[PDB]
Design a protein around this ligand. Sequence first.
Ligand code: CA
Ligand code: CA
Ligand code: CA
Ligand code: CA
Ligand code: CA
Ligand code: CA
Ligand code: CA
Ligand code: CA
Lengths: 213, 213
Amino acid sequence: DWVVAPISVPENGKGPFPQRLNQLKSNKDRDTKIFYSITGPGADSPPEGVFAVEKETGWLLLNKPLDREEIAKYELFGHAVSENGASVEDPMNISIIVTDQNDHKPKFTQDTFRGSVLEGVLPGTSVMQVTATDEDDAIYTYNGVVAYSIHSQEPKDPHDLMFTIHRSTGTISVISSGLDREKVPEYTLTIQATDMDGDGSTTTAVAVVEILD
Amino acid sequence: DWVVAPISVPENGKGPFPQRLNQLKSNKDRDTKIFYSITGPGADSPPEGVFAVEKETGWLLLNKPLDREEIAKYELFGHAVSENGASVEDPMNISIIVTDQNDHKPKFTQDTFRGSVLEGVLPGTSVMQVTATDEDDAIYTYNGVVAYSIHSQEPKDPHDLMFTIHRSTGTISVISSGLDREKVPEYTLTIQATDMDGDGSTTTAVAVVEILD
Ligand SMILES: [Ca+2]
Ligand SMILES: [Ca+2]
Ligand SMILES: [Ca+2]
Ligand SMILES: [Ca+2]
Ligand SMILES: [Ca+2]
Ligand SMILES: [Ca+2]
Ligand SMILES: [Ca+2]
Ligand SMILES: [Ca+2]
């Protein structure tokens, strides 16, 4: 059968609402009067009334701006019904895909993360993992794609770059020899998490590393 | 910098294990002896020892078959370290992407679903929703993509096709006039859920529809 292609609707649209997405039509309408309707989540089950059809004209309408982070996709059936009350067609699948906007910044799961590591480890040893989440899409776009970096280390003894952080996983690793509890018992790493794979918004948190024995 | 491209590894591989994925190498190895190592979840944090590196030869190894449904992606750092114990390189990102196998069939969330609908509704009214989940990937493949169909309706009074089911959402809708509690108080819809968007395995469950007043 000929069917509606999936309609892409960006989230957070400016209107005007209700907004026309597509006009539903059965050719049998030259022969008798046709009444259009839609079913499914978004239509007549929760969340109800997000979409509507104009029963005479067949206009599918979006009633309000959409949020991808709430529902990413709607699937409905359009129904064509005679003046009598009989179905004049098989129901037609209607797909609405909500495309993503970068409308969320990265949030660290806490403000300070505490970890520890033994005082004699060789470059290339995991210490701890920090996490920042972004609620936007990471599959089709970079909006939800977080890049981690160390902004600074305090203090700079024995020298500055003692640690590294995995850009995708926020795993912090020792990368230089020379950790010693007697000299330096604790480091503070200022961490950044930047969405759009490091081109979007930056958020900052802190990682405190205890040097053990 | 030149870096390793993301390595695609299909889940459930037959071996031989440990399996060689890629050979890590710093050219500085003509000048001094180099020792290779890896950090991150999958390496030296949980799940540990899923991957390994041969410290002299630089061979990255997968130790055991993988399950996408457990972890879909690993990200590690490779480290190049001198005979002394000093880092001779910035750590290199290593991505392992586990590609999906259709190794799960659709499972209905229960064996029987109960719903109800008023006795006078017009074609195009939602009744209830049935759900079958598939644990395979629905993004990159159809393995986890469930298609619903009604296999049969009991009994066939006033006639057979009184209901329909949304192929993607498992929403059941009235599609014909004529429901009457006095004549028929309950229908049993035999439902199917077929993964690979209806080309894979079928599973069967039952939907019981009470005709209300
Ligand atoms: Ca949003
Ligand atoms: Ca974002
Ligand atoms: Ca968004
Ligand atoms: Ca970029
Ligand atoms: Ca599996
Ligand atoms: Ca499957
Ligand atoms: Ca699978
Ligand atoms: Ca197909």
